[PDB]
Structures are given as structure tokens and as C-alpha cells.
Amino acid sequence: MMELIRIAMKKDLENDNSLMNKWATVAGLKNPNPLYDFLNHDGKTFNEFSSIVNIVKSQYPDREYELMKDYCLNLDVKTKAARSALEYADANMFFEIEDVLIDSMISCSNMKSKEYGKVYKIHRELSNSVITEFEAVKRLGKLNIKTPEMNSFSRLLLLYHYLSTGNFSPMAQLIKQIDLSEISENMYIRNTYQTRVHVLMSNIKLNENSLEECREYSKKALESTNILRFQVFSYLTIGNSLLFSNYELAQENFLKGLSISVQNENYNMIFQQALCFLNNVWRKENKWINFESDSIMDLQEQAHCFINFNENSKAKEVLDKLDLLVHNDNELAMHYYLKGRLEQNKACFYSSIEYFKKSNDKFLIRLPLLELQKMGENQKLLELLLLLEHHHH
Amino acid sequence: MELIRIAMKKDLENDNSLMNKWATVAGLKNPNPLYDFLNHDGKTFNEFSSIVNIVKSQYPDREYELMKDYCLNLDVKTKAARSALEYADANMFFEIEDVLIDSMISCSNMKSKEYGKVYKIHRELSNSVITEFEAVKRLGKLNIKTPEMNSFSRLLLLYHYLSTGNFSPMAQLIKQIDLSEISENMYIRNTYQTRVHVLMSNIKLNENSLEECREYSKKALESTNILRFQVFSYLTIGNSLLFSNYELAQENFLKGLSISVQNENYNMIFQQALCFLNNVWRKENKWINFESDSIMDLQEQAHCFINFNENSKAKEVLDKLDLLVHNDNELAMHYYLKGRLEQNKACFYSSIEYFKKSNDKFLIRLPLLELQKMGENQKLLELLLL
DNA sequence: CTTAAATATTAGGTTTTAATAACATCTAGT
DNA sequence: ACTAGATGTTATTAAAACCTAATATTTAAG
Structure with a gap:
């Protein structure tokens, strides 16, 4: 299957050959050769998710949801790209993308992807009051979180709970323990x-x-x-x-x-x-x-x-x-x-x-x-x- | 040979009526277990109240002295030790409780291991050595098995929710406690x-x-x-x-x-x-x-x-x-x-x-x-x- | 003081689960 | 396309949780 964003970029490139150099700057690439790969090879992803996000946001701002929903939902979930797509969907509150990814990632064989989905499910369940703050932090302890990314998101989804209910007191202490500088794999996730x-x-x-x-x-x-x-x-x-x-x-x-x-x-x-x-x-x-x-x-x-x-x-x-x-x-x-x-x-x-x-x-x-x-x-x-x-004083 | 046994031997020599009275105090049908208790080092009662109620009835003015000697001598791999744990915390006898904790955390009994580890969390949390996020995270990783500790994990949060004064999610957390699911340790259940x-x-x-x-x-x-x-x-x-x-x-x-x-x-x-x-x-x-x-x-x-x-x-x-x-x-x-x-x-x-x-x-x-x-x-x- | 039935505790042997690293794949940019 | 570098998978091992067997201990009637 070819994704809509690739069809789009092929057509736009035919009518405007200057786009390749310009997409490569928007995408953080040193030259556009990965962008040929991307258009021609099914499965080709970029190292950081912002490369495709900023290209979509620059060429097709009015279609971001349509193209990103189609793009994310054909990602192999076992990949860094798809971990990236999880935070992408949650951040924009695209819950139909977020929840489909989560259930694929929870039963998939990649330990990182499973860990990401699993704490993200916890955050959905907590924020939809399907479980309790008490149940949720337990499951977080039980997961024995390995990645810095989920270490930081586990404190973030709690802060998102404290904020929703109202309990403001411990937030200033909890948020100060977040240390984004420990994140080294996923700069998309770190920057969001x-x-x-x-x-x-x-x-x-x-x-x-x-x-x-x-x-x-x-x-x-x-x-x-x-x-x-x-x-x-x-x-x-x-x-x-x-x-x-x-x-x-x-x-x-x-x-x-x-x-x-x-x-x-x-x-x-x-x-x-x-x-x-x-x-x-x-x-x-x-x-x-x-x-x-x-x-x-x-x-x-x-x-x-x-x-x-x-x-x-x-x-x-x-x-x-x-x-x-x-x-x-x-x-x-x-x-x-x-x-x-x-x-x-x-x-x-x-x-x-x-x-x-x-x-x-x-x-x-x-x-x-x-x-x-x-x-x-x-x-x-x-x-x-x-x-x-x-x-x- | 524990002090409380000694005291019981002496008071029994001077008042032979005490055996039947201790037995009702202790909830025994007959006081033959009380004989065993006095004659054999290591004798414990099915229920920790038996010795606590006796001590309260005959030695109310030496409860700390005698229970500290009695607890600190139990075998920590035992249901009398687990009971002694809660007893220690409940009376705020921290010097008893804390000693009991260090020895049950590395003892070979799976159940004592579990009790000791969730009471360490409770002392640490209430002494501000860890946060409640860190505390609840550890209770999750213990994969708590005993109904006793399932209940106490909710209780040690409720006390922190009190000390600080979060006060609000209290009423929904406490409702989750189901004491009726406790079958082994009736002393812990009742306290x-x-x-x-x-x-x-x-x-x-x-x-x-x-x-x-x-x-x-x-x-x-x-x-x-x-x-x-x-x-x-x-x-x-x-x-x-x-x-x-x-x-x-x-x-x-x-x-x-x-x-x-x-x-x-x-x-x-x-x-x-x-x-x-x-x-x-x-x-x-x-x-x-x-x-x-x-x-x-x-x-x-x-x-x-x-x-x-x-x-x-x-x-x-x-x-x-x-x-x-x-x-x-x-x-x-x-x-x-x-x-x-x-x-x-x-x-x-x-x-x-x-x-x-x-x-x-x-x-x-x-x-x-x-x-x-x-x-x-x-x-x-x-x-x-x- | 014994002791039998009920209750707790300890161990032996099993399955699951998890940590290590050797191998393989995929990415960015010449 | 193809190479270094960065990521993903898998094979091998440790381990740790998990039952079922056996062993101990407790209560209360002899």
C-alpha cells in the first residue's frame, strides 16, 4: 500500500522539482537522498518523526490529520517511527489514532514498543477514569520501566491527572523530578x-x-x-x-x-x-x-x-x-x-x-x-x- | 527464655487460679497451650491477641517492656512475627517495628518477606525518605499476594493522604478496602x-x-x-x-x-x-x-x-x-x-x-x-x- | 503430659519471565 | 547504490516467580 503523503509528494514534485531540496531542509536532512528512498521504498521511515511532521505541516497544513492518520495507521508498530506516532497522536488529542496504535503495540514483540504502548494505555485509562491513580501508578511500578522516555511520561501522565481532578499541591514537586535530558533516543518525543x-x-x-x-x-x-x-x-x-x-x-x-x-x-x-x-x-x-x-x-x-x-x-x-x-x-x-x-x-x-x-x-x-x-x-x-x-516573607 | 514467660511462671506459682483465667483472656478452649507456652522455647499462639490480651490483663504497666522483649525474640519467618510487626506499628513502637523490618526483608519466608517490604515502604513514605509516587510504584512491583498486605497498601497511602492533608481522594480509596478478604491473621484483621x-x-x-x-x-x-x-x-x-x-x-x-x-x-x-x-x-x-x-x-x-x-x-x-x-x-x-x-x-x-x-x-x-x-x-x- | 486433626511452613522441581549479547536490519549522507 | 552508525531481532542464559509435596506446629480432647 502507498500512503497518501507519498502519493501527494510525488504529484507535487512532478509539478515542481524545486521541492526536493526544500523538503530536505524542512526535514533536517543534509541532502534529500533519504527523500527518494522515502517516496520509492515502502516502509522507509526517517530517524526522527519531525521530518515527516514538518513536511506535512509545510506542504499540506490543511490536510495534516487526513495524511497523518493514513501515515501512522500503516506504520509497522515495532519501530521508533511508530513510538513517535503514539506521542504524536496523544499530543494532538487524536484519540482514534492513539488507541489503535496502543492495542497493536501492547501485544507486539518489540520490547520498547510494548513498553511505550503499555504506559500510554495507563494514561488513557486513568484520564478516562477507567482506573484509579492508585491502580495506575501500581501498574507503572509493575512494568519496571526501562526507557527514559516512559520514565518521563509516567510522571507526565500523573501531572495530567492531578491537573484534571484539581489537586495542585504536589505538582510543583512532582514535575521538578522530570529530567528530559536523560532522553537520548527520540528527540521528537523529548521536544514535545x-x-x-x-x-x-x-x-x-x-x-x-x-x-x-x-x-x-x-x-x-x-x-x-x-x-x-x-x-x-x-x-x-x-x-x-x-x-x-x-x-x-x-x-x-x-x-x-x-x-x-x-x-x-x-x-x-x-x-x-x-x-x-x-x-x-x-x-x-x-x-x-x-x-x-x-x-x-x-x-x-x-x-x-x-x-x-x-x-x-x-x-x-x-x-x-x-x-x-x-x-x-x-x-x-x-x-x-x-x-x-x-x-x-x-x-x-x-x-x-x-x-x-x-x-x-x-x-x-x-x-x-x-x-x-x-x-x-x-x-x-x-x-x-x-x-x-x-x-x- | 522471654521475660513474660518468667513473669507468668512466678505469678502462677503464687496464684494457681491464673491458668484458667489466662486461657479465657487468650481465647483458648482450655489452657493446655498455656503449659506449652511456658515449658517450650519457641511456642507461639495461633493468634497474637492471646499473648497481648494476657499481657494487658496481668501486666498492663509493663506492656512495652515485655512486648519489646517478646517480639524482638520471635522467629521473623513466622505468623507471630508478622502479627508482631502490625502490633509494633499500631502502637507506634518504632524501635520494635524497624528491627523487625530489616530481618524480614531478607528472611527466607515469602510471606514475612512481603510484610516486611510493604511496612518499609510505609515507614520510608511517612518519614519522607521517598515520595508517594515512588512508594505506590514499589507496592506495584512487589506484586502483593497476601490479602493482609493488599489491605495495608491502601492503608499506608491513607495515612500519608492524612499527614500531608490531601484529604480528598481519601473517601474513595478507603472504600476500596475489603477487610473481609482476610482469612489468615485475625489480629491484623481486627486492628x-x-x-x-x-x-x-x-x-x-x-x-x-x-x-x-x-x-x-x-x-x-x-x-x-x-x-x-x-x-x-x-x-x-x-x-x-x-x-x-x-x-x-x-x-x-x-x-x-x-x-x-x-x-x-x-x-x-x-x-x-x-x-x-x-x-x-x-x-x-x-x-x-x-x-x-x-x-x-x-x-x-x-x-x-x-x-x-x-x-x-x-x-x-x-x-x-x-x-x-x-x-x-x-x-x-x-x-x-x-x-x-x-x-x-x-x-x-x-x-x-x-x-x-x-x-x-x-x-x-x-x-x-x-x-x-x-x-x-x-x-x-x-x-x-x- | 500425649496426640490427631487442622493449620502453617519449607522445599523440590517446574514453568515463566526477564537480562545479555551476538546477529541482523535500517538509516543518513558520501 | 553503499558505508558507518544507529536501531531491531533473536539465541542463550540467568532468575524469579509458582506450584505441589513434605514437613512443622498449633489447638484442644485423651
């Missing part, structure tokens, strides 16, 4: 894990309330990667670190995330909601509100446009719609915050804080608090509910 | 059952489920004759009451004091708990310690003086405390005392600050109560308790 650490470092500094460091680590992330997923969330993170303090710089960062995600439905919508919510927080005319949606979040942000602009009747219509819907803890907290501003009623604001606490939200909880501050309450106490790290 | 009650009480403590917390502490007290679990069950029940019911609180602290009379450390804990309880409730305080210059005892002098309007005498104490190294939890108290003494709300805000900096959802009531006295929004400082 380096991006991964930057992102994790960024989020840790976010919750330690060290926002300028948060922004530096996300900057380091962006400079370290060409992977949309990581780029997307570094801009998200940066903007959130600025959402309540610097309107124009947060909007600048959200728009940059919006621009690079025009073609990705999930990622474009994330920045749409963020811009909408940003502009509501700052009481601005809001081009981002979605009047054709009956989700809770979209509906909530309408009530916010309205309450912001003294359209009190029209905000009542939306909250009446909301009253009929399945609210969870964090969504009710927003409800109460909205109901509070509409009825100017401190008691809602209190319930708002209450359900933000219950849903362990140290971020949107600024909304009820600011409102109470504008109504004569004791700012010193309001600060203590938003329990921010203070950095004393 | 692990006490352990779970104790842990369940502390879980329900940090969910402010105080009536359930007192229930689990109760079930612990009924399930055990180990002074450790009894001391901390009574302390736990008092603290659960310390801000709502002065009398029932004191009654539990007093009860804890009476069983701890011969133990220096357990006695101090209860003197300090009574001292702080009465300072909380602004009573005359017969439990102050005027010779101790520890931060905690000095703090409570300041607290008593402030209670009784001797502000000048409490400033003398606070000046002495001003030049001693405070951690976050200690500093919180200091800001509490300074705020009461000075009638200064900013000191209370700071105290709430340093109370949340050590994740103390207990003693933080002190500043919150003072600000409610001073006119602040009760709905607001209700929220500070979450």
Missing part, C-alpha cells in the same frame, strides 16, 4: 515533552497566583511547538491570566487563538466563548454573543449582555428559560450571580459564592465578589474568599 | 478494622460531618484495646465538640487523660486540649503550664490573661513569643491573640489568612467569632468556613 512541561509549568504558576511567570511559561510553550493543541491552550491560559486585569491584552490573546483555529470547530468555539465572556466582564458592546444557541453557557452570556445594558426585562426572559434546565454546581453559581445582579439581591450573590466554592472555582468567583464590593461589603473579607497566594 | 474506623472518623471530620465523625470514633473505641487508637479517638470526639458543647467536650478530654496517666506524651496532649478548651470557653483554667516556654503553652497563657482582662500580663507573654520562630499555624494563633489584645481587625484578617495557609478549617473559628462580635457580616464569615 518539553512543550508539555512548559504548559504544565504555566498552569502551575497560574494557581500559585504567579501570573507573570504563568505568561512566561506559556510563552516558552508557544516558542517550543508547532502543535495546534498546545498553541491553543497557551493563548487560552495567557488570556485567562489577564481576563480580569487587562482587557485589551486579554482580547488580543483570545483573538490570536481565534485566528489560528478558524478550521477547528472545537477550538474556534472556545475562543468565541472566551471573547464573549471577556467582553461581558468588561461591560463592553459584545459582538460575540450567540443568539442561535440554547446551551446554558450561551444563554447565560445573553443575560450578561442584557443586565450590562439595563435590558432587565430581556434578561428575565433568558433566566426564565434557564430556570427549566439541568444546572450543575458551577452553572448554578453563574445563575445566582446573574439573578443577583438582576434583582440586586445580596442573597443570590451569597449562594453564588457558595456554589463556586462547592465546584471549587477560584476564578469566576470574582464575579459575585466584585458585585458585593460595589454594595458596601467589607473588601478585606471579600479578598479572603478569593483565597489567592500572597507570597509573604 | 486494621480499628484503623479504618479511625480513618473514617477523620474523613467525616473534614467533611464537617461531626455527628458521623463521633460515630466512627465510637466504633473505633469499641473495636480496640490499643492505647494509641483510644487516645486519638477521645481527642477526636472532644475536638469535634470543642466549639458547641463545652461539657461533653471536656468529658471526653478528661476520659482520655485518665487512660493516659502513665504515658507522658498522651497525657500532655490532653492537658493541652483541656487548657485550650477552657480558654475557648473563657473559664478559669487549671490546666495552664507556667513552666513550659513552648509556643503552644505560652500562647495559652496569653489567651487566659486576655480572657481575664489582664492585657498587660498578656503583652508580657506576647513579647516573649515575638522572638520565637513561628510556622504558619503558630503565626495564625499569634495574630489571633494580638487582635484580641489590641482590638484590631487587621490582625484577625491576618489570622484567617494564616489559618487558610495551613488548611486549618478548625481553629479558624477563633478570628471569625471575634469579627462577628465586632459587627461584621455574619453571612460573609460563614462563607470563610468552606
Whole structure:
């Protein structure tokens, strides 16, 4: 079988012979002779996976998934190339590629490939709550990990668990034991894990309330990667670190995330909601509100446009719609915050804080608090509910 | 020839009635095994409680002396040694436990090897020699076979989850424990059952489920004759009451004091708990310690003086405390005392600050109560308790 | 004090699993 | 294409976990 990327490159090369020298620079090669091999010989892989990733990202950016899915799924799993494809798929959250590779690699006869798949299955199972952190780290001990790559990914997938649930305390200690410099086989994996650490470092500094460091680590992330997923969330993170303090710089960062995600439905919508919510927080005319949606979040942000602009009747219509819907803890907290501003009623604001606490939200909880501050309450106490790290001597 | 055997021989010569009584204490149908125990070096009982309950009944004031001699002489390749292990940890007899560990880790018995190795992980983990990631990784590589150690691997994590104060994944991890899967070693089963009650009480403590917390502490007290679990069950029940019911609180602290009379450390804990309880409730305080210059005892002098309007005498104490190294939890108290003494709300805000900096959802009531006295929004400082 | 039945413990012999390295393949670049 | 260098496979050995047999020890009735 010939892979789509090889068919593509053959056709493009026929219509443009200058491509071979240019692909060879994109691929890190000293001259393009491996690139003949690659096109003509089934099974030919390059020593590092970034050679085919950067060629795909440069010649066919709009088709990366289609070609990489076809490429990875015909890789012999016993090879370094395919180990590389596992991290590739996980990093971009291509779970249909990731999980097919994993099950092939777990029963394959190559000890490295088996080890890679096996800890990667653990990370999927843990992050889908099919097993427990306790069960998962046990299986990690039981595998008797040999490769530096999985040594480092075993601590990474835990940090990805701590982050999801919420337990931020031991992360700064756990991540500091990661030592990527011990990796010597797979520079693709090393360089992505380096991006991964930057992102994790960024989020840790976010919750330690060290926002300028948060922004530096996300900057380091962006400079370290060409992977949309990581780029997307570094801009998200940066903007959130600025959402309540610097309107124009947060909007600048959200728009940059919006621009690079025009073609990705999930990622474009994330920045749409963020811009909408940003502009509501700052009481601005809001081009981002979605009047054709009956989700809770979209509906909530309408009530916010309205309450912001003294359209009190029209905000009542939306909250009446909301009253009929399945609210969870964090969504009710927003409800109460909205109901509070509409009825100017401190008691809602209190319930708002209450359900933000219950849903362990140290971020949107600024909304009820600011409102109470504008109504004569004791700012010193309001600060203590938003329990921010203070950095004393 | 072990001391406890010697003591038993002598007391038997002077009271021949003891053989039948020891046998019921030990759960034997008849005391013929007790003869063997006295006549033959190396005789052990099917169940470790037999000798523990005897020792507790006839020699309650020499339990450490006699059990240390008895354990440290067992054959570590044996179920009496395994039992002796848990016994050692459960009473916090670390000099017994640790010696037992080094010898079972390299002994030829597969089962003792396994026990010794998961208790090494537990000591190392709780002494901060390894991390919990490293610890759990090793429990995986042991490929634990015995139900006993399957249960204790979850337990030693739950204690670390306590010491640090991760507190949250506790309630799902402890539910995974299934003590009924233990068939070999009933002593270990029953003390692990006490352990779970104790842990369940502390879980329900940090969910402010105080009536359930007192229930689990109760079930612990009924399930055990180990002074450790009894001391901390009574302390736990008092603290659960310390801000709502002065009398029932004191009654539990007093009860804890009476069983701890011969133990220096357990006695101090209860003197300090009574001292702080009465300072909380602004009573005359017969439990102050005027010779101790520890931060905690000095703090409570300041607290008593402030209670009784001797502000000048409490400033003398606070000046002495001003030049001693405070951690976050200690500093919180200091800001509490300074705020009461000075009638200064900013000191209370700071105290709430340093109370949340050590994740103390207990003693933080002190500043919150003072600000409610001073006119602040009760709905607001209700929220500070979450 | 014996001792038989039940329970624990130790060992002999087996299968699995894992570490070593000798051999073979594949890659990059002349 | 073909060579050095870097990776993959396989043959050979150690080993370590794993049962089933035998041996010891415990309880409680003689």
C-alpha cells in the first residue's frame, strides 16, 4: 500500500522539482537522498518523526490529520517511527489514532514498543477514569520501566491527572523530578515533552497566583511547538491570566487563538466563548454573543449582555428559560450571580459564592465578589474568599 | 527464655487460679497451650491477641517492656512475627517495628518477606525518605499476594493522604478496602478494622460531618484495646465538640487523660486540649503550664490573661513569643491573640489568612467569632468556613 | 503430659519471565 | 547504490516467580 503523503509528494514534485531540496531542509536532512528512498521504498521511515511532521505541516497544513492518520495507521508498530506516532497522536488529542496504535503495540514483540504502548494505555485509562491513580501508578511500578522516555511520561501522565481532578499541591514537586535530558533516543518525543512541561509549568504558576511567570511559561510553550493543541491552550491560559486585569491584552490573546483555529470547530468555539465572556466582564458592546444557541453557557452570556445594558426585562426572559434546565454546581453559581445582579439581591450573590466554592472555582468567583464590593461589603473579607497566594516573607 | 514467660511462671506459682483465667483472656478452649507456652522455647499462639490480651490483663504497666522483649525474640519467618510487626506499628513502637523490618526483608519466608517490604515502604513514605509516587510504584512491583498486605497498601497511602492533608481522594480509596478478604491473621484483621474506623472518623471530620465523625470514633473505641487508637479517638470526639458543647467536650478530654496517666506524651496532649478548651470557653483554667516556654503553652497563657482582662500580663507573654520562630499555624494563633489584645481587625484578617495557609478549617473559628462580635457580616464569615 | 486433626511452613522441581549479547536490519549522507 | 552508525531481532542464559509435596506446629480432647 502507498500512503497518501507519498502519493501527494510525488504529484507535487512532478509539478515542481524545486521541492526536493526544500523538503530536505524542512526535514533536517543534509541532502534529500533519504527523500527518494522515502517516496520509492515502502516502509522507509526517517530517524526522527519531525521530518515527516514538518513536511506535512509545510506542504499540506490543511490536510495534516487526513495524511497523518493514513501515515501512522500503516506504520509497522515495532519501530521508533511508530513510538513517535503514539506521542504524536496523544499530543494532538487524536484519540482514534492513539488507541489503535496502543492495542497493536501492547501485544507486539518489540520490547520498547510494548513498553511505550503499555504506559500510554495507563494514561488513557486513568484520564478516562477507567482506573484509579492508585491502580495506575501500581501498574507503572509493575512494568519496571526501562526507557527514559516512559520514565518521563509516567510522571507526565500523573501531572495530567492531578491537573484534571484539581489537586495542585504536589505538582510543583512532582514535575521538578522530570529530567528530559536523560532522553537520548527520540528527540521528537523529548521536544514535545518539553512543550508539555512548559504548559504544565504555566498552569502551575497560574494557581500559585504567579501570573507573570504563568505568561512566561506559556510563552516558552508557544516558542517550543508547532502543535495546534498546545498553541491553543497557551493563548487560552495567557488570556485567562489577564481576563480580569487587562482587557485589551486579554482580547488580543483570545483573538490570536481565534485566528489560528478558524478550521477547528472545537477550538474556534472556545475562543468565541472566551471573547464573549471577556467582553461581558468588561461591560463592553459584545459582538460575540450567540443568539442561535440554547446551551446554558450561551444563554447565560445573553443575560450578561442584557443586565450590562439595563435590558432587565430581556434578561428575565433568558433566566426564565434557564430556570427549566439541568444546572450543575458551577452553572448554578453563574445563575445566582446573574439573578443577583438582576434583582440586586445580596442573597443570590451569597449562594453564588457558595456554589463556586462547592465546584471549587477560584476564578469566576470574582464575579459575585466584585458585585458585593460595589454594595458596601467589607473588601478585606471579600479578598479572603478569593483565597489567592500572597507570597509573604 | 522471654521475660513474660518468667513473669507468668512466678505469678502462677503464687496464684494457681491464673491458668484458667489466662486461657479465657487468650481465647483458648482450655489452657493446655498455656503449659506449652511456658515449658517450650519457641511456642507461639495461633493468634497474637492471646499473648497481648494476657499481657494487658496481668501486666498492663509493663506492656512495652515485655512486648519489646517478646517480639524482638520471635522467629521473623513466622505468623507471630508478622502479627508482631502490625502490633509494633499500631502502637507506634518504632524501635520494635524497624528491627523487625530489616530481618524480614531478607528472611527466607515469602510471606514475612512481603510484610516486611510493604511496612518499609510505609515507614520510608511517612518519614519522607521517598515520595508517594515512588512508594505506590514499589507496592506495584512487589506484586502483593497476601490479602493482609493488599489491605495495608491502601492503608499506608491513607495515612500519608492524612499527614500531608490531601484529604480528598481519601473517601474513595478507603472504600476500596475489603477487610473481609482476610482469612489468615485475625489480629491484623481486627486492628486494621480499628484503623479504618479511625480513618473514617477523620474523613467525616473534614467533611464537617461531626455527628458521623463521633460515630466512627465510637466504633473505633469499641473495636480496640490499643492505647494509641483510644487516645486519638477521645481527642477526636472532644475536638469535634470543642466549639458547641463545652461539657461533653471536656468529658471526653478528661476520659482520655485518665487512660493516659502513665504515658507522658498522651497525657500532655490532653492537658493541652483541656487548657485550650477552657480558654475557648473563657473559664478559669487549671490546666495552664507556667513552666513550659513552648509556643503552644505560652500562647495559652496569653489567651487566659486576655480572657481575664489582664492585657498587660498578656503583652508580657506576647513579647516573649515575638522572638520565637513561628510556622504558619503558630503565626495564625499569634495574630489571633494580638487582635484580641489590641482590638484590631487587621490582625484577625491576618489570622484567617494564616489559618487558610495551613488548611486549618478548625481553629479558624477563633478570628471569625471575634469579627462577628465586632459587627461584621455574619453571612460573609460563614462563607470563610468552606 | 500425649496426640490427631487442622493449620502453617519449607522445599523440590517446574514453568515463566526477564537480562545479555551476538546477529541482523535500517538509516543518513558520501 | 553503499558505508558507518544507529536501531531491531533473536539465541542463550540467568532468575524469579509458582506450584505441589513434605514437613512443622498449633489447638484442644485423651
